[PDB]
Design a protein around this ligand. Structure first.
Ligand SMILES: [Cl-]
Ligand SMILES: [Cl-]
Lengths: 281, 281
């Protein structure tokens, strides 16, 4: 694995490349959720045994949001962190640096929004998208009021945790939940994480309409946990996208982070997703 | 199907496009043998029922050598016909005109030489090659002496026929042989065909060496008939190419033009060839 950084209009971004480029295939490019990094977000999936057998035949580029990279400095107080749209705009710089011309994007939560935005802006560079927990809607006033009321008695880590996991997972307090609670609550870059969180909260409508012009032009696999926080947004997202090109993997017993709890079934879905795109997997 | 022509440094070339471009796949591009056109060379294969089910998922560009296109004028006496290398050099113009960035080339005889030459010159545009009856060696003096001796008592059509079919096929005189004999002997563009024939005869070494630098960098399927005229050249070609990337389909009972006599088995080989490249077929 080789870690790189590239300069962009909005600051430096770090990414780690794994594997070897397969002739005339897209790179797999990932973007992680708020509170996480590529490792805490994607390691259980990309290191799953069945996944390793698929990804041998791809090069992989795992992006860390600015400030999330290993050994990131804490951005200065009052720093103007990139919006999600600006984050999406760092990806052309990444690909140009690597000389990769096309990708299959895999994103979770804010990372899914970013990869969707990227795909709208650069549709000829995107062969497919796996969009986990995607919520393409800006908060409306009712959302802002509820969020701010919640914020009065919840810490920043508790709120990020509530974005990642269901209330029931957070109450049940499994070993995975305990580990992720410590990760976020005691992160040395929590100030950086909070800026990314604010980004996410302030994102604009990703404005899919079934029947163009604002539509995704590529195969999409939508993923969400049954009864998880983002379920309604992913369901709604499924009704806006082109049905001939879109599959919806709504998983029972996966909770808020399906790529962490059910990497085996997700892997198998990815295999069929690649096959339906026309790649042997 | 849409027929197009493009201007090049060496004159106009015609080509017919079939099907619809499949996102992020190579176009299938064909180049026919001496004495034929894309139709007399490739129709039994590309219209084979099993083939139609594969090629639904590709756009196809069938090139007619200059002078072989429907309604071609007879080139003026003393015309300087393109060498095979110049013919190979017309292909960048074809692809640029269509805005296609990569191909899988399928060639027979002189068309296989041309597509191989093209691939050496533009390796990043070639995803794979099916090379039928390829003979990458210039004639040496012993070859020239034999050819010219043969020429004293054989007509131009008889010699072209002997390039396409085995002596045993030509003696046995099947219905296919009768049809192809009439096609060539009574072609209205025979003067054009003869110029292409002279091209072929005057070609230079395509200088494969097992271990680079002059080597094909892509999957290759070599095809020849058992005991057919080009058998030894294809066998020799197989020993120069990279074994990890090269498959050799030496067909029993196919004769001089395997794409005409065994399109079903050739189709099935093409399917596995695509699968080994990493495309579902
Ligand atoms: Cl990986
Ligand atoms: Cl066709």
């Amino acid at each position: 694995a080789k870690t790189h950084s590239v300069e962009t209009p909005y600051g430096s971004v770090t990414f780690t490349v794994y594997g070897t480029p397969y002739p005339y295939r897209p790179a797999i490019l990932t973007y992680h959720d708020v509170g996480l990094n590529y490792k805490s977000c994607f390691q259980p999936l990309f290191q799953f045994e069945d996944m390793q057998e698929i990804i041998q035949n791809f090069v992989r580029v795992h992006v860390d949001a600015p400030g999330m990279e290993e050994g990131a400095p804490v951005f200065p107080l009052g720093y103007q962190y990139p919006s999600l749209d600006q984050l999406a705009d760092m990806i052309p710089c990444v690909l140009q640096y690597l000389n990769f011309s096309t990708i299959i994007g895999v994103g979770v939560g804010a990372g899914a929004y970013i990869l969707a935005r990227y795909a709208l802006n650069h549709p000829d560079t995107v062969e497919g998208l796996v969009l986990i927990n995607i919520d393409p809607n800006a908060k409306g006033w009712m959302d802002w009021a509820a969020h701010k009321l919640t914020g009065l008695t919840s810490s920043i880590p508790e709120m990020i945790l509530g974005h990642l996991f269901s209330q029931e997972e957070l109450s049940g307090n499994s070993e995975l939940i305990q580990k992720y609670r410590n990760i976020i609550t005691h992160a040395p870059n929590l100030d950086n994480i909070e800026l990314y969180w604010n980004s996410y909260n302030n994102r604009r409508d990703l404005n899919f309409e079934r029947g163009g012009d604002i539509t995704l032009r590529c195969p999409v696999m939508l993923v969400v946990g049954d009864q998880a926080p983002h379920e309604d947004a992913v369901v709604e997202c499924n009704s806006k996208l082109d049905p001939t090109q879109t599959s919806f993997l709504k998983m029972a017993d996966s909770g808020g982070q399906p790529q962490l709890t059910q990497p085996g079934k997700l892997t198998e879905a990815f295999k069929y997703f690649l096959q339906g795109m026309g790649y042997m997997a």
